[model samples]
Target: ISLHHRAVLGSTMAYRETGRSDAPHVLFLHGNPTSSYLWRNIMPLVAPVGHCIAPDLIGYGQSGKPDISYRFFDQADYLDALIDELGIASAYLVAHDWGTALAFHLAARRPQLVRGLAFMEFIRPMRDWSDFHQHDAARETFRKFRTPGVGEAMILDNNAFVERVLPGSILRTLSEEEMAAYRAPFATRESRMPTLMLPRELPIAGEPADVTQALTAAHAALAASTYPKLLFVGSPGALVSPAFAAEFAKTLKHCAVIQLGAGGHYLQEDHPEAIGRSVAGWIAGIEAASAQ
Candidate 1:
């Protein structure tokens, strides 16, 4: 199944698929401002043991641009519909950033649909700005994006998040071609709304009650899940700091933590091979245990 597939699941969901459709599913969900291409180098590595599927979030990549709120909740219905259309019985969840939020949300809502889970660079924005002081600029910029007029001006008009924040988060300088691929989707102000809405929807101070409730459900599901877990931590990571990874692992009932050296937020770009290998190895462990 080494091909791209598209379906009209409320909105168009363009996806990449590999491995046997009959095998256990391994669904790779990416974060903000990225698509299924993020998993390009890694899917083959995981294909040996599981079915791999990666979808471009609605309004991104080759996916159809739906006229919707593009809220955190908006992303889930599309995913649910895609799985239903594809007839995936259950999947091992592997996700990053916004994808992790969705993964957690889905698992919380339909626990039986998730077999196991793995995540990288996942984060939680706190009730207030105090918790984000890890780097002084983090709070400053997030604050700007959350502000009413300021956000539209910076993100929509100036393309702050995509051009600046996206590149700045990566330690390695992206090639011109890579930038072009990222830029292709959001060619105009209207198309950039999904990127703009993400910062604004950070769920600060318990506001945006629905999103906050979703976050709570996500965390509760993580705390209670008996599923096998893999947490990938990168050196000088943004969301999952080394300390955070160590501390958080204690709370999980079944977990494995892999340290991929010298990377930033987008580990896919910097350490894809390492990520792929670690994931494949982790799946082997799960399979071995299950067979025994």
Candidate 2:
């Protein structure tokens, strides 16, 4: 089926509920320049097992775009409020892109809400780019956008960037339809503010020192987090760097890392079945352990 569409927690925040309410909930969070629509491919896998609540953070998807600042912490606040409204106290989290950053922010404060954590092409602070330079272009692009006037024009008016520039980071070619799905939400320039602002929010090099510090602390907490975790890497992305993953893996207490042979940043779009199966297996394992 489709999302159980509606606006909740006020401000026209759009959200959907799929799968069984009785089953353990899996909260899916999407990152920049995209919406909950990103999760369209992999919903079926976990839907069979439990509920999946994926919402377009404020200024995204079907959600409200109130006249407010679009900051990463703000996105986390929207998530926190939505989960409260949905009464989802515990969930398996599958996050990608910007969602990865927001997920850690939420999980750090509300660890009880997250039973497990899954990362797909997510970021963690690394010493330098020798191992993870592929994202350099993206990082630079974000930095530029954070600039006084340039960012507004590039993110708000430049539809071409999402359609042409960033999609290149993925492993497989997105179908015209898939590309449309990513592009559909930002029909107008004003509606695209969140997309524009997101690049600036990246906390690289201690430039956005506060954001970087928060992410750094959260990354450390995620490593020490008792919740089960999984990290998925696609072949083309910078995050899959052997050195980077190795360093990040050292922090995990219970985590699994998988590299999809052909998966890219958008693994769900590239190999939904593989992504689904991996999650299902993780869920099954968690269930088995709980039963024991």
Over 1-292, each residue of candidate 2 has an lDDT whose tens digit, in order, gives 2444445556766666778777889888887677777777677778877688888888887788788778887787777778877788888899987899888878887877788888777866645433334666755765567688887777677764576555866666778877777777788888887777666666656656778888898887787788888888766555565445656677688877877766446666677778778887898789789879
Q: Positional deviation of 29 in candidate 1, in angstroms?
A: 0.5
- Local distance difference test, per candidate? 0.84, 0.74
TM-score of 1: 0.95
TM-score of each: 0.95, 0.91
Each model's number of backbone clashes? 0, 1
Against the true structure, what is every candidate's RMSD?
1.8, 2.3
Residue 237 local lDDT, model 2: 51
Tens-place lDDT per residue, model 1, 1-292, is: 2336567655677899888776789999998888887888899899988899998888877888989988887888888888888887788889998899888888888889887888998856477777653586878998888889999999889888779888877878989988888888888998889898877777678867888888877887888999899999888888778888889899887988889878778889888888888888888788789879
Candidate 2 residue spans exceeding 4 A from truth: 5-9, 126-140
Model 1: which ten-residue window has the lowest total lDDT? Answer: 1-10
